RNA sequence: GAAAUUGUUGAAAGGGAAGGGCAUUUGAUCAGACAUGGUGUUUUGUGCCCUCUGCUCCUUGUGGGUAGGGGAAUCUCGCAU
């Protein structure tokens, strides 16, 4: 089969997922945010991308069915997108985005929005090269760190056919 | 098990075979790539760390295992090797902490749990070792799983715990 | 059948019956009021001293 | 399947009666009260809000029942709010 495989993140290996947030984008997430994912009311989609039977990519998104008290962004919210720097240039992020778009289309949705930092240009250009559109400019005080650091954020949206 | 594949040979050969093997491994690693071939890169790093740990080397082995963890931190064997190196260097508590942190990544394997319990028993930590072991055991008429461990006919656990008791009594 | 007014857990409360007994109401009620409030291991030993004439059973009403 | 009647739990009482009238402390118990009816403004989810309007039946005057979309910053015409 293909060297890049997909798997559903379970609970026993959930502790591995929390490790990804510590080897991708530090100072952004906590521990309760990952502990309350499988704690037995929003729909959460988890995906683990293996490269030659090795966990290399992680995707955690949340579905928002609300539309009454919201402007225009009902769809899959790409929250955690962890890809190691050593595992790039192999269409791994492309496969993750394709799986996200497939899960968005299977949930009767036609909009995918993602939040990105304002002090990062390489990741911004990488996400724009796929086919995203910037929503306005930046957001004043949106990203909250671990110690208490705050910065601006940008929104990238895409319409799914 | 690559090092295992050369484990008995190292018990019979040394200054004649190990230098050639090290040279071949270095020549193979010098032509690899951390991005194009990540799997061969991490396996070569693990083999080099094993070979240097067998040759009574510790700083270079720690450097290699740290580079391997920074390259791919999703392998239990790396944490096991780090715990073994820290145990050989006299750091039992740090090894137990690292191995527990690595075991918390995936809670489905029993070999890693037994290794963690053994390393905690070797680290003068009995209560935490029992609390960790009391998970996959059958809990019925007891607050922990000591009765279950005694009913499954154990031996190594009792031996490792009695040694910790003797060390704590001698201290 | 059933019983009376209970105020405990019926899941861990054993009981018997044995109806049709030609004894005496004034004696059965009195010995039931006297044995009430004591433990089982003490009630089993207190009844052995009644036949030996040591601790009699007084009357109230 | 009710009553005089004894049995347990729970509450009251007591210096030769209890029981009761006018009223009440205390314990137990209990419905009603519109603390949910409306005026008019700020709010969003939104519908018969603009709309592609379809399929099906009585007959004017402005035609009745059945359903999948595009924008929800027009509108309070509607329910929560």
């Amino acid at each position: 089969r293909d060297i890049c495989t997909l798997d559903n993140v379970y609970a026993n290996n959930l502790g591995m997922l929390t490790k990804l947030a510590h080897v991708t984008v530090p100072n952004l997430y906590q521990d309760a945010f990952f502990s309350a994912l499988f704690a037995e009311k929003d729909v959460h989609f988890t995906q683990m991308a293996y490269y030659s039977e090795i966990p290399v990519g992680g995707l955690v998104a949340k579905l928002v069915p609300k539309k009454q008290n919201e402007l225009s962004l009902k769809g899959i919210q790409i929250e955690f997108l962890g890809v190691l720097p050593n595992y790039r240039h192999k269409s791994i992020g492309s496969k993750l985005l394709k799986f996200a778009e497939d899960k968005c289309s299977e949930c009767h949705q036609h909009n995918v929005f993602v939040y990105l930092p304002a002090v990062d240009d390489l990741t911004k250009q990488w996400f724009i090269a796929h086919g995203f559109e910037q929503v306005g400019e930046t957001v004043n005080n949106f990203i909250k760190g671990v110690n208490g650091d705050e910065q601006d954020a940008i929104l990238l949206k895409k319409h799914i056919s | 098990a690559t090092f295992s594949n050369v484990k008995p040979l190292y018990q019979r050969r040394k200054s004649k075979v190990s230098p050639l093997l090290e040279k071949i491994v270095l020549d193979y690693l010098s032509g690899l790539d951390p991005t194009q071939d990540p799997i061969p890169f991490i396996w070569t790093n693990y083999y080099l760390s094993q070979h240097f740990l067998f040759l009574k080397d510790f700083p270079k082995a720690q450097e290699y295992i740290d580079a391997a963890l920074d390259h791919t931190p999703t392998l239990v064997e790396f944490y096991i090797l780090k715990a073994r190196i820290l145990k050989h260097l006299g750091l039992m508590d740090t090894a137990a902490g690292i191995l527990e942190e690595g075991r918390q990544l995936d809670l489905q394997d029993r070999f890693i749990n037994c290794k963690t319990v053994k390393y905690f028993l070797r680290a003068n930590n009995i209560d935490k070792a029992v609390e960790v072991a009391s998970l996959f055991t059958k809990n019925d008429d007891s607050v922990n799983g000591i009765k279950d461990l005694h009913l499954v006919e154990a031996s190594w656990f009792i031996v490792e715990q009695a040694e910790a008791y003797y060390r704590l009594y001698l201290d | 059948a059933r019983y009376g007014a209970t105020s405990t857990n019926p899941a861990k409360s054993a009981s018997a019956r044995g109806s049709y007994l030609r004894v005496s109401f004034k004696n059965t009620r009195e010995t039931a009021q006297a044995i009430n409030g004591w433990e089982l291991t003490k009630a089993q030993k207190y009844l052995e001293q009644v036949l030996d004439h040591q601790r009699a059973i007084p009357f109230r009403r």
Side-chain angles (χ1 to χ4, degrees), chain B residues 12-76:
Chain B
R12 302 293 178 90
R13 306 292 292 274
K14 191 175 182 179
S15 65
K16 188 70 175 177
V17 175
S18 60
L20 294 174
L21 285 172
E22 184 178 1
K23 184 178 184 293
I24 292 169
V25 170
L26 289 175
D27 291 331
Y28 181 74
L29 183 62
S30 66
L32 289 176
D33 186 74
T35 62
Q36 294 297 109
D37 291 331
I39 300 98
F41 181 70
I42 61 171
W43 283 115
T44 300
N45 290 318
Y46 181 76
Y47 183 75
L48 284 171
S49 184
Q50 290 286 328
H51 186 74
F52 278 104
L53 182 63
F54 185 78
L55 291 176
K56 293 182 183 292
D57 194 0
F58 296 102
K60 191 180 287 185
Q62 282 185 351
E63 290 179 353
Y64 272 102
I65 199 65
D66 289 331
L69 288 173
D70 187 74
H71 191 276
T72 302
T74 62
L75 288 176
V76 184

Side-chain angles (χ1 to χ4, degrees), chain A residues 3 12-20 23 51-56 84-90, chain B residues 34-39 42-43 69-76 79 101-102 104-108:
Chain A
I3 192 166
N12 290 318
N13 55 3
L14 184 62
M16 183 67 76
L17 181 65
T18 307
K19 184 69 175 177
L20 293 175
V23 298
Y51 185 76
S52 179
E53 287 90 8
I54 292 172
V56 302
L84 292 174
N86 291 317
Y87 294 100
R88 292 180 181 177
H89 295 285
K90 290 181 175 65
Chain B
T35 62
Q36 294 297 109
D37 291 331
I39 300 98
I42 61 171
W43 283 115
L69 288 173
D70 187 74
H71 191 276
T72 302
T74 62
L75 288 176
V76 184
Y79 291 100
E101 289 179 356
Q104 288 178 356
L105 301 175
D106 195 0
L107 299 174
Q108 65 181 356

Side-chain angles (χ1 to χ4, degrees), chain A residues 29-39 42-66 70-71 73-94:
Chain A
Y29 293 100
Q30 296 291 323
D31 292 331
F33 182 75
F34 290 100
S35 296
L37 294 175
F38 288 162
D42 291 331
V43 178
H44 295 285
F45 293 100
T46 60
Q47 172 57 253
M48 196 70 76
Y50 292 164
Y51 185 76
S52 179
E53 287 90 8
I54 292 172
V56 302
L59 183 62
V60 175
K62 183 175 73 175
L63 179 61
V64 178
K66 263 63 186 299
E70 192 68 29
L71 187 63
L73 48 91
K74 178 173 70 68
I76 295 296
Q77 180 178 2
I78 299 170
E79 289 178 350
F80 178 75
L81 195 147
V83 173
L84 292 174
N86 291 317
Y87 294 100
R88 292 180 181 177
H89 295 285
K90 290 181 175 65
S91 70
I92 297 170
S94 296

Side-chain angles (χ1 to χ4, degrees), chain C:
Chain C
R2 297 291 299 274
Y3 292 100
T6 62
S7 66
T8 186
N9 193 0
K12 297 183 290 294
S13 296
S15 65
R17 191 177 295 275
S19 296
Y20 290 164
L21 294 174
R22 189 184 298 275
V23 197
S24 179
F25 182 76
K26 294 180 182 180
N27 289 319
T28 52
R29 191 263 182 191
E30 190 66 31
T31 190
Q33 292 297 109
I35 200 167
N36 193 1
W38 290 351
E39 293 179 353
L40 189 142
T41 184
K42 292 177 71 68
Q44 286 184 353
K45 293 189 287 185
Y46 180 75
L47 293 175
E48 294 292 328
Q49 294 179 356
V50 179
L51 277 76
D52 197 74
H53 294 89
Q54 183 66 42
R55 293 181 68 188
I57 302 299
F59 291 99
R60 292 180 181 177
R61 185 181 297 115

Side-chain angles (χ1 to χ4, degrees), chain B residues 54-121:
Chain B
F54 185 78
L55 291 176
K56 293 182 183 292
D57 194 0
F58 296 102
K60 191 180 287 185
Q62 282 185 351
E63 290 179 353
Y64 272 102
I65 199 65
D66 289 331
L69 288 173
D70 187 74
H71 191 276
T72 302
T74 62
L75 288 176
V76 184
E77 292 86 4
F78 289 164
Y79 291 100
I80 293 169
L81 176 55
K82 183 175 173 66
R84 185 176 179 179
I85 292 168
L86 291 174
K87 181 180 74 173
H88 283 288
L89 283 175
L91 277 78
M92 283 71 74
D93 293 333
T94 307
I98 268 86
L99 195 65
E100 177 66 28
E101 289 179 356
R103 185 188 67 84
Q104 288 178 356
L105 301 175
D106 195 0
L107 299 174
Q108 65 181 356
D109 186 74
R110 192 176 178 181
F111 178 76
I112 186 63
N113 193 0
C114 293
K115 185 178 289 295
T116 303
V117 171
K118 182 174 73 175
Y119 284 171
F120 269 101
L121 289 175

